[PDB]
Amino acid sequence: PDTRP
Amino acid sequence: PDTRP
Amino acid sequence: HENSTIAERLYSEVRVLCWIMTNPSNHQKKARHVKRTWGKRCNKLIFMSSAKDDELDAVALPVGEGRNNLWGKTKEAYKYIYEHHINDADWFLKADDDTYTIVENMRYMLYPYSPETPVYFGCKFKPYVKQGYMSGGAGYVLSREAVRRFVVEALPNPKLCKSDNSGAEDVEIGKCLQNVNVLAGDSRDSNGRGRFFPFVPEHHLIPSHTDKKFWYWQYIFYKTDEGLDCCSDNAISFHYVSPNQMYVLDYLIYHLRPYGIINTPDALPNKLAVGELMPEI
Amino acid sequence: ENSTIAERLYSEVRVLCWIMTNPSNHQKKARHVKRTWGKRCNKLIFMSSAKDDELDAVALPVGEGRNNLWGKTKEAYKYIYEHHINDADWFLKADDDTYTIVENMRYMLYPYSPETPVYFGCKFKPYVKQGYMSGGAGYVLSREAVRRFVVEALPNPKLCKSDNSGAEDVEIGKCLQNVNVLAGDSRDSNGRGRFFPFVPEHHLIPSHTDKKFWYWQYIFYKTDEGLDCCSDNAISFHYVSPNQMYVLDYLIYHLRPYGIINTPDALPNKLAVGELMPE
Ligand SMILES: O=c1ccn([C@@H]2O[C@H](COP(=O)(O)OP(=O)(O)O)[C@@H](O)[C@H]2O)c(=O)[nH]1
Ligand SMILES: O=c1ccn([C@@H]2O[C@H](COP(=O)(O)OP(=O)(O)O)[C@@H](O)[C@H]2O)c(=O)[nH]1
Ligand SMILES: *[C@H]1O[C@H](CO)[C@H](O)[C@H](O)[C@H]1NC(C)=O
Ligand SMILES: *[C@H]1O[C@H](CO)[C@H](O)[C@H](O)[C@H]1NC(C)=O
Ligand SMILES: [Mn+2]
Ligand SMILES: [Mn+2]
């Protein structure tokens, strides 16, 4: 997963 | 006048 | 760990009473967070409102709400303080509920000055008052003798001191105080860097507005370009600080340090005689 | 003012800092890392896809895009091993929106042998048994960790992902676990964090109390955060804007409350090769 804002 | 940021 | 012996000694030698202008809408949103951060470092903290409040122990001034009554709250607050607290402190700070004050740096600046010297300090502006006035947001601090003259000599004379409750709070007190021979002190450090600031640190470190007729560059009494040079290592106040940012400033100023870089305090100047200010920068 | 202790650690704990950036960020972001915290490192290197006079940027043989960041990490540690392995004891990876108090990093690293295979950062639990370190918060490898990575993991596609795609920080976490590099614990002796993937406000005042937020699931060591979150010797914050680099610099290094003198905790004793701190 993409855990950027 | 007011003097804001 | 920290050794705070020096600042505990100044705590007792330089008593600062801090009053905070607020209103019922701000009691929980803003005023609370002043009390929980920098407020508790003052010798005496007072919230000056139009309504009472258990949490703040707020004083209800006989003054309505709105921007049109800020001058009336200032007058009533200094009257109340003279009535009840004039011997409770040496120095009397007015701040907003979006002002952030490093109280230890205020005691540092005020140490040499006699509380019997008629003087107040802040961020000095040029217009409307010959000797300048102090930004209401940046906070300004009056000597005991300055509070006496204000309440005893200026308020009872309508020619010296505006009797309606309307107007710019900080311009009006600037006029009353010039009219009773209170001096507009110079709050800059010995290198000429500012200590009292009407904006957040970013806005002084990185001035975005570029001398383009913006009011600040026209109002400032002492000319400066600001930038990374703007700001004293012993700066006293910033303003338009959000409730959350009160806690961040507290953390970065009081808690976070680079290991092995020990702030060594500059020596305290010698006490001044009544009526005397420090050598001009 | 008295910086004797920090000058002594400067020479005893050499830290090389490399910054992941790209040409679009050279002037907007990377410059401001160099002008603030970057110059406090023993050695500062900008790792890009193109050269730059001002930064003295290294051009890695790697395309741009978020799907080549793992390729830039591999090529950067290769370059650093090739050219700088005996120029420092510790090798920090950071982004161009990371802010590092380098003196606090030296404080944390002092006791550890550079010959101990270990790295430190903000530890997350998913995808790697022993955990991995937040790319944004920054993570720092021992000399011995960098040697194993470049000499033992990179050549072996079974140990270390050979495509240039994936989460840079997860991938290095995997390569390092596979060559017996330890995931150190970077918390202070009171259990407060030192490496932070967000700005200070976000850790001091946790807004996403919304516990579904990925951070509360990823964090390796349990914490509430709040006004308690953060060490007096915190090392890094992230999602720091270029302007905020100068503010943190001012508030940390310059502004102080008169007559409150920070007194340093005594340095722990040096550890044996292979040894970590207790607790
Ligand atoms: O109707 C009002 C508006 C403002 N204030 C107070 O007056 C000061 C000025 O308000 P604010 O900080 O919002 O504006 P600024 O004048 O700094 O732009 C603050 O202490 C406010 O809490 C008030 O008591 N009643
Ligand atoms: O196409 C890209 C996008 C990002 N980056 C770099 O990758 C890191 C992570 O990106 P950013 O800080 O923008 O986002 P984050 O991943 O921290 O949410 C930074 O060091 C950027 O300079 C890059 O080299 N090329
Ligand atoms: C700006 O100036 C006005 C008067 O023109 C008021 O004195 C106002 O309080 C000032 N603002 C600040 C932040 O000091
Ligand atoms: C969040 O997690 C992803 C993988 O799920 C990546 O490791 C990403 O870099 C993480 N973000 C931060 C800020 O550490
Ligand atoms: Mn205000
Ligand atoms: Mn980033």
Side-chain angles (χ1 to χ4, degrees):
Chain A
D2 186 1
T3 56
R4 281 133 88 213
Chain B
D2 75 277
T3 36
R4 288 181 103 113
Chain C
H1 259 298
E2 22 71 44
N3 190 192
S4 68
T5 290
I6 289 180
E8 283 179 54
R9 178 222 148 188
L10 286 191
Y11 180 87
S12 72
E13 282 216 55
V14 187
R15 296 164 307 134
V16 181
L17 183 148
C18 307
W19 78 263
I20 314 298
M21 195 147 59
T22 188
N23 60 88
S25 311
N26 288 2
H27 282 181
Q28 328 307 325
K29 276 211 148 48
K30 301 204 188 194
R32 170 148 86 182
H33 303 301
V34 170
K35 167 150 204 189
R36 290 175 190 188
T37 67
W38 68 263
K40 56 150 147 57
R41 300 198 175 95
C42 298
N43 302 71
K44 178 62 177 192
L45 178 57
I46 310 198
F47 290 97
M48 295 289 193
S49 194
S50 50
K52 298 279 169 209
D53 180 286
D54 291 327
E55 172 155 39
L56 302 173
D57 197 19
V59 174
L61 297 181
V63 187
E65 272 306 321
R67 238 87 214 325
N68 269 309
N69 284 307
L70 299 193
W71 172 227
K73 287 190 157 158
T74 296
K75 287 187 301 195
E76 287 301 316
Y78 275 115
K79 272 201 252 170
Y80 180 92
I81 283 172
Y82 176 81
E83 218 157 320
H84 292 97
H85 298 295
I86 194 58
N87 296 307
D88 287 348
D90 305 312
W91 298 91
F92 305 81
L93 180 59
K94 183 266 168 182
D96 288 357
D97 44 25
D98 57 348
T99 307
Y100 180 95
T101 306
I102 307 88
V103 176
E104 288 75 13
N105 283 337
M106 197 146 70
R107 295 203 185 91
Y108 175 50
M109 178 185 79
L110 292 177
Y111 178 74
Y113 292 89
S114 166
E116 244 57 27
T117 302
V119 65
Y120 80 131
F121 295 99
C123 178
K124 185 138 64 166
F125 294 158
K126 224 160 48 176
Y128 315 120
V129 197
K130 172 179 160 132
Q131 70 171 3
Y133 80 91
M134 307 304 177
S135 173
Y140 58 66
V141 55
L142 274 65
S143 63
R144 189 168 49 243
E145 175 56 12
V147 171
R148 275 185 268 140
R149 293 200 185 182
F150 181 57
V151 182
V152 172
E153 292 168 19
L155 285 183
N157 197 356
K159 292 157 153 180
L160 302 185
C161 202
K162 171 162 186 203
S163 46
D164 10 3
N165 295 350
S166 70
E169 173 271 325
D170 52 3
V171 170
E172 294 316 322
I173 203 176
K175 300 186 169 199
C176 304
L177 292 170
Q178 186 182 252
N179 288 338
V180 289
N181 265 215
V182 172
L183 301 162
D186 183 355
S187 59
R188 292 171 311 154
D189 76 4
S190 59
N191 298 298
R193 288 168 154 105
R195 282 199 266 198
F196 285 87
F197 291 101
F199 317 134
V200 299
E202 193 178 319
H203 287 176
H204 294 293
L205 285 168
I206 322 291
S208 61
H209 288 108
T210 41
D211 291 60
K212 44 167 52 76
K213 258 66 269 188
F214 183 65
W215 70 263
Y216 184 69
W217 306 115
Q218 291 183 126
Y219 277 49
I220 199 109
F221 190 93
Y222 304 110
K223 196 254 110 225
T224 169
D225 297 301
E226 289 190 335
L228 273 16
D229 251 332
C230 52
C231 300
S232 182
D233 292 352
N234 300 284
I236 294 175
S237 81
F238 294 100
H239 172 249
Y240 294 115
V241 179
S242 77
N244 285 1
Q245 203 61 26
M246 303 269 170
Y247 296 96
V248 175
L249 287 176
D250 247 33
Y251 170 70
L252 302 166
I253 298 169
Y254 287 93
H255 289 274
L256 185 47
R257 75 281 305 267
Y259 186 81
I261 304 180
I262 305 175
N263 50 165
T264 48
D266 309 316
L268 282 180
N270 283 277
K271 300 270 217 205
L272 299 161
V274 178
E276 190 188 5
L277 271 32
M278 292 290 286
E280 260 283 275
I281 310 306
Chain D
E1 297 280 349
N2 175 7
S3 65
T4 299
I5 290 171
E7 281 175 49
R8 187 210 140 192
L9 288 203
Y10 180 88
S11 72
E12 279 213 51
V13 187
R14 297 163 306 140
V15 177
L16 180 149
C17 309
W18 76 264
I19 314 294
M20 195 149 53
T21 187
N22 60 87
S24 318
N25 286 7
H26 280 185
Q27 325 308 324
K28 295 164 186 163
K29 295 197 198 196
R31 174 149 89 188
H32 303 303
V33 170
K34 172 158 169 135
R35 284 141 138 275
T36 68
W37 67 267
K39 58 151 144 55
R40 300 193 180 97
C41 298
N42 303 72
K43 180 66 177 186
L44 179 55
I45 308 175
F46 290 96
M47 292 293 189
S48 194
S49 49
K51 257 172 171 310
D52 181 288
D53 277 3
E54 169 157 41
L55 300 174
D56 194 16
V58 171
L60 294 184
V62 187
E64 271 307 320
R66 277 204 68 88
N67 270 307
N68 283 307
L69 297 195
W70 172 225
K72 283 194 166 155
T73 292
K74 286 191 301 200
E75 293 300 321
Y77 274 112
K78 268 202 255 162
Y79 179 93
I80 283 171
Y81 173 82
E82 225 175 321
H83 292 93
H84 296 296
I85 192 57
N86 290 308
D87 289 345
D89 304 314
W90 299 92
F91 305 81
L92 178 59
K93 183 267 169 182
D95 289 357
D96 44 23
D97 55 350
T98 307
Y99 182 93
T100 306
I101 307 85
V102 178
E103 290 78 9
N104 283 337
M105 201 148 72
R106 291 203 187 92
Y107 173 49
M108 180 183 80
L109 293 176
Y110 177 77
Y112 290 91
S113 169
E115 245 51 76
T116 306
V118 63
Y119 80 131
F120 302 89
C122 181
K123 181 142 64 171
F124 294 161
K125 75 195 190 202
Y127 314 121
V128 199
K129 175 172 188 172
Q130 69 173 6
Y132 78 92
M133 307 301 176
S134 173
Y139 56 71
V140 56
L141 272 66
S142 65
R143 190 168 48 245
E144 175 54 18
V146 170
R147 201 187 56 80
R148 293 199 185 187
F149 179 57
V150 179
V151 165
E152 298 175 3
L154 282 189
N156 194 355
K158 294 155 144 147
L159 300 184
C160 201
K161 169 166 186 197
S162 40
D163 13 1
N164 294 348
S165 64
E168 171 270 326
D169 53 2
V170 169
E171 293 313 325
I172 202 170
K174 303 194 150 179
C175 305
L176 293 169
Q177 188 181 253
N178 291 336
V179 289
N180 295 323
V181 172
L182 301 161
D185 181 356
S186 57
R187 290 170 314 152
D188 78 1
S189 60
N190 309 306
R192 289 166 183 235
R194 284 197 267 199
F195 286 86
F196 292 102
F198 309 106
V199 299
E201 193 181 306
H202 182 306
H203 294 297
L204 286 164
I205 326 291
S207 61
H208 290 108
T209 315
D210 151 56
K211 214 73 181 175
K212 296 190 269 288
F213 190 61
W214 68 263
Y215 182 70
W216 303 115
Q217 273 106 98
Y218 277 48
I219 198 111
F220 192 98
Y221 306 106
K222 194 231 131 208
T223 170
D224 40 291
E225 237 82 328
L227 297 180
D228 251 326
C229 52
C230 300
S231 180
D232 295 348
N233 301 283
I235 294 175
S236 80
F237 293 100
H238 171 252
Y239 293 115
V240 179
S241 77
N243 286 355
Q244 205 61 21
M245 304 260 169
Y246 295 96
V247 174
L248 288 177
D249 247 34
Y250 165 72
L251 296 169
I252 297 169
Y253 287 94
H254 292 281
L255 184 51
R256 76 282 232 114
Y258 186 83
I260 303 175
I261 302 186
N262 56 317
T263 43
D265 272 55
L267 285 178
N269 270 269
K270 296 262 216 213
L271 298 161
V273 181
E275 211 194 326
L276 307 177
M277 295 287 273
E279 207 273 330

